[PDB]
């Protein structure tokens, strides 16, 4: 990525990352599964049910996506009727 | 009140308790092997050379209710202990014996030739007309 831009001297986000992923405020990245809309005629319904899911990301995938976006994308967002809003705070972890 | 000192956890040690709430486990497994062990009560017909025999069992193999023709009460009113009349007779007798045992649901699983025998169709018609449903309610999870 660009660590220091030529105009501002700031970091830049990679906009592929924003275009594909969802950062929850607790640090979890949500994604969509690869091939969830390809060749559905030859996939069993169990597999199609698996592909139509919002799948969390790895730890190192998560840290790779944190480094590729900026602090704007890491921020609390109090939207109006947000579908994912109950998934931001992390309930009831025992580490 | 001394009278209403109730333990917070009721203990019912009726063996047939959980099976009559249709809550108790059936042995779900055994899919490569005949017959299925998934029942609470099984009706097992034993047709020997000479005698027709009818059992009602648990999964334990504890025979709950039997009716054989090797029994003077039923044998003497019969012509031959092995024919279709023997099976209709042992179906009436078995069904009447099972209503008074508080058993209302068996499973009968025959081989596909014993299914299409006349004497077991007559046995099943005797059981169903007697008052016993030959199909268990599902387990409530």
């Amino acid at each position: 990525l660009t660590y220091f831009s030529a105009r501002k001297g700031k970091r830049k986000t990679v906009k592929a990352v924003i275009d594909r992923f969802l950062r929850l405020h607790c640090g979890l990245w949500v994604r969509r599964k690869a091939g969830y809309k390809k060749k559905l005629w030859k996939k069993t319904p169990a597999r199609k049910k698996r592909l139509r899911e919002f799948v969390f990301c790895n730890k190192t995938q998560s840290k790779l996506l944190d480094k590729m976006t900026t602090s704007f994308w890491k921020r609390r967002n109090w939207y109006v009727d947000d579908p994912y809003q109950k998934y931001h705070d992390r309930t009831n972890l025992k580490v | 009140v001394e009278n209403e000192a109730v333990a917070p956890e009721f203990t019912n040690r009726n063996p047939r308790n959980l099976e009559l709430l249709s809550v108790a486990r059936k042995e779900r497994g055994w899919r490569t092997v005949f017959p299925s062990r998934e029942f609470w009560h099984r009706l097992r017909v034993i047709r020997t050379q000479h005698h027709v025999e009818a059992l009602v069992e648990h999964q334990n193999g504890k025979v709950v209710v039997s009716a054989s023709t090797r029994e003077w009460a039923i044998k003497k009113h019969l012509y031959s202990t092995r024919n279709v009349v023997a099976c209709e007779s042992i179906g009436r007798v078995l069904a009447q014996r099972c209503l008074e045992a508080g058993i209302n649901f068996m499973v009968y699983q025959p081989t596909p030739w014993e299914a299409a025998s006349d004497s077991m169709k007559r046995l099943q018609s005797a059981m169903t007309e007697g008052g016993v449903v030959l199909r268990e309610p599902q387990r409530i999870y």
Partner: protein
């Protein structure tokens, strides 16, 4: 002139050895042909994989194999046997740990 044969290991075999506590739905063992058969409280997938249907402890036994009468392969294998000959297989059982619920006092009406 020997092309192909570069397939990797399937990583099959037993996942829960005997004595292991097992929760409901755990895969006990994945096989490619029936090395182990489902016994008490053990289910089978389309891939011949043995999973668990109750929570309990896995046990392996040796039992009499009596196939379903509509299974003409194994049934035709039966009728060729001599008169004492009885087939055995190894089965997998889950001995269920918990009771399936208790009665508890709710209210003194």
């Amino acid at each position: 002139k020997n092309l192909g044969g570069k397939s990797s290991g399937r990583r099959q075999g037993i996942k829960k050895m005997e004595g292991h506590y097992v929760h409901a739905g755990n895969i006990i063992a994945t096989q490619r042909h029936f090395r182990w058969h489902p016994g008490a409280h053990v289910g089978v997938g389309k891939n011949k994989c043995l999973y668990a249907l109750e929570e309990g402890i896995v046990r392996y036994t040796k039992e009499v194999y009596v196939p379903h009468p509509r299974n003409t392969e194994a049934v035709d294998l039966i009728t060729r046997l001599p008169k004492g000959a009885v087939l055995y297989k190894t089965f997998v059982h889950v001995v269920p740990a918990k009771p399936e619920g208790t009665f508890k006092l709710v209210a003194m009406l």
